[PDB]
Design a protein around this nucleic acid. Sequence first.
DNA 1: CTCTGTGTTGAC
DNA 2: TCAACACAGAG
Length: 102
Amino acid sequence: RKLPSSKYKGVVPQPNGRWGAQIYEKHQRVWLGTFNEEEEAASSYDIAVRRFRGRDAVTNFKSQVDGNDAESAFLDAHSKAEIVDMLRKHTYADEFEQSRRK
DNA sequence: CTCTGTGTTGAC
DNA sequence: TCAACACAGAG
Protein backbone atom coordinates (compact mmCIF):
# COMPACT_ATOMS: atom_id res chain seq x y z
CA ARG A 1 0.00 0.00 0.00
CA LYS A 2 3.12 2.19 0.26
CA LEU A 3 3.51 4.20 -2.92
CA PRO A 4 6.42 3.51 -5.30
CA SER A 5 9.35 5.91 -5.45
CA SER A 6 10.78 7.37 -8.65
CA LYS A 7 14.23 6.89 -10.09
CA TYR A 8 14.05 10.50 -11.28
CA LYS A 9 14.56 13.81 -9.50
CA GLY A 10 11.56 15.95 -8.61
CA VAL A 11 9.07 13.11 -9.22
CA VAL A 12 6.74 11.77 -6.51
CA PRO A 13 4.04 9.05 -6.55
CA GLN A 14 0.42 10.10 -6.78
CA PRO A 15 -1.89 7.64 -4.88
CA ASN A 16 -3.71 6.52 -8.10
CA GLY A 17 -0.57 5.19 -9.85
CA ARG A 18 0.03 8.56 -11.47
CA TRP A 19 3.02 10.81 -10.85
CA GLY A 20 3.59 14.36 -9.65
CA ALA A 21 6.44 16.82 -10.27
CA GLN A 22 7.95 19.44 -7.98
CA ILE A 23 10.89 21.87 -7.99
CA TYR A 24 12.23 23.50 -4.83
CA GLU A 25 13.01 27.23 -4.84
CA LYS A 26 14.40 28.61 -1.56
CA HIS A 27 12.16 27.10 1.12
CA GLN A 28 9.15 26.61 -1.16
CA ARG A 29 8.03 23.60 -3.19
CA VAL A 30 6.71 24.59 -6.62
CA TRP A 31 4.27 21.99 -7.92
CA LEU A 32 4.70 21.25 -11.62
CA GLY A 33 1.63 19.05 -12.14
CA THR A 34 0.48 15.45 -12.28
CA PHE A 35 1.01 13.06 -15.15
CA ASN A 36 0.12 9.52 -16.19
CA GLU A 37 3.72 8.58 -17.07
CA GLU A 38 6.72 8.78 -14.75
CA GLU A 39 8.95 9.84 -17.66
CA GLU A 40 6.63 12.78 -18.34
CA ALA A 41 6.95 14.07 -14.77
CA ALA A 42 10.72 13.71 -15.16
CA SER A 43 10.75 15.76 -18.38
CA SER A 44 8.60 18.46 -16.77
CA TYR A 45 11.10 18.68 -13.92
CA ASP A 46 13.96 19.00 -16.42
CA ILE A 47 12.28 21.93 -18.19
CA ALA A 48 11.55 23.64 -14.87
CA VAL A 49 15.12 23.26 -13.58
CA ARG A 50 16.63 24.57 -16.82
CA ARG A 51 14.42 27.66 -16.48
CA PHE A 52 14.99 28.12 -12.72
CA ARG A 53 18.70 27.24 -12.54
CA GLY A 54 20.22 27.60 -16.02
CA ARG A 55 21.83 25.59 -18.79
CA ASP A 56 24.43 23.84 -16.57
CA ALA A 57 21.95 22.29 -14.12
CA VAL A 58 21.45 18.60 -13.41
CA THR A 59 18.56 16.99 -15.29
CA ASN A 60 16.93 13.58 -15.48
CA PHE A 61 17.33 13.33 -19.27
CA LYS A 62 19.16 16.41 -20.57
CA SER A 63 22.66 16.93 -21.81
CA GLN A 64 24.28 19.81 -19.85
CA VAL A 65 26.32 20.43 -23.04
CA ASP A 66 23.89 22.64 -25.00
CA GLY A 67 24.37 26.21 -23.81
CA ASN A 68 22.48 28.30 -26.40
CA ASP A 69 19.56 26.70 -28.31
CA ALA A 70 15.91 27.38 -29.14
CA GLU A 71 14.90 25.88 -25.81
CA SER A 72 17.05 28.41 -23.96
CA ALA A 73 15.47 31.12 -26.12
CA PHE A 74 11.91 30.01 -25.34
CA LEU A 75 12.63 29.60 -21.62
CA ASP A 76 14.36 32.97 -21.33
CA ALA A 77 11.54 34.72 -23.23
CA HIS A 78 9.07 33.63 -20.53
CA SER A 79 8.64 34.19 -16.81
CA LYS A 80 9.17 31.37 -14.32
CA ALA A 81 5.43 31.47 -13.60
CA GLU A 82 4.56 31.05 -17.28
CA ILE A 83 6.78 27.96 -17.66
CA VAL A 84 5.33 26.45 -14.48
CA ASP A 85 1.81 27.06 -15.81
CA MET A 86 2.71 25.52 -19.17
CA LEU A 87 3.97 22.39 -17.44
CA ARG A 88 0.95 22.14 -15.13
CA LYS A 89 -1.39 22.61 -18.12
CA HIS A 90 0.52 20.17 -20.40
CA THR A 91 0.90 22.92 -23.01
CA TYR A 92 4.70 23.40 -23.13
CA ALA A 93 5.33 21.51 -26.38
CA ASP A 94 2.49 23.30 -28.20
CA GLU A 95 3.67 26.74 -27.05
CA PHE A 96 7.25 25.95 -28.11
CA GLU A 97 6.02 24.84 -31.55
CA GLN A 98 3.95 27.97 -32.13
CA SER A 99 6.87 30.05 -30.84
CA ARG A 100 9.41 28.72 -33.32
CA ARG A 101 6.81 29.07 -36.12
CA LYS A 102 8.59 32.48 -36.25
C1' DC B 1 -18.31 13.25 -6.01
C1' DT B 2 -12.71 12.69 -7.52
C1' DC B 3 -8.05 13.24 -6.55
C1' DT B 4 -4.72 17.03 -6.63
C1' DG B 5 -1.20 19.23 -4.32
C1' DT B 6 -0.68 21.49 0.28
C1' DG B 7 0.70 20.86 5.13
C1' DT B 8 4.11 18.89 7.62
C1' DT B 9 8.01 16.51 9.03
C1' DG B 10 12.58 14.74 9.00
C1' DA B 11 16.76 12.94 6.58
C1' DC B 12 20.74 15.26 4.21
C1' DT C 1 17.23 21.33 -0.51
C1' DC C 2 14.82 17.14 -1.00
C1' DA C 3 10.95 13.31 -0.64
C1' DA C 4 7.21 10.51 2.33
C1' DC C 5 2.93 10.54 3.91
C1' DA C 6 -1.86 12.10 5.36
C1' DC C 7 -5.90 14.21 3.99
C1' DA C 8 -7.94 19.45 3.58
C1' DG C 9 -10.03 21.28 0.27
C1' DA C 10 -9.68 22.51 -4.83
C1' DG C 11 -12.06 21.32 -9.09
